[PDB]
Amino acid sequence: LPGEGTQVHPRAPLLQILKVAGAQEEVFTVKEVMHYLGQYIMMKQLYDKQRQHIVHCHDDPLGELLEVGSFSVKNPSPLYEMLKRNLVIL
């Protein structure tokens, strides 16, 4: 994945998730994408209430993009693999 400052355009299914989180732009840095994804998970309360590094994304549009039912913030490879599939590097 590109570093810092590099601009990316999310594909439509990812952009729809970012829009729920309040994103109004079409072009982002990777860090900004991560900011909106964190906001989305928070707003939808997908994190496990007791073990808050675990995110339960089954039965949510985010799980359809990640292709996993749950993930750990400490093992974020599924998130970055999803971003590689869903970001156009500008």
């Binding site: 991560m34 928070m42 994190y47 808050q52 913030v73 400490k74």
Partner: peptide, 14 residues
């Protein structure tokens, strides 16, 4: 006892 917000921020900023 760390919150999801703090854990995600740690990753985001790393």
């Amino acid at each position: 006892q760390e919150t999801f917000x703090d854990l995600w921020k740690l990753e985001l900023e790393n």
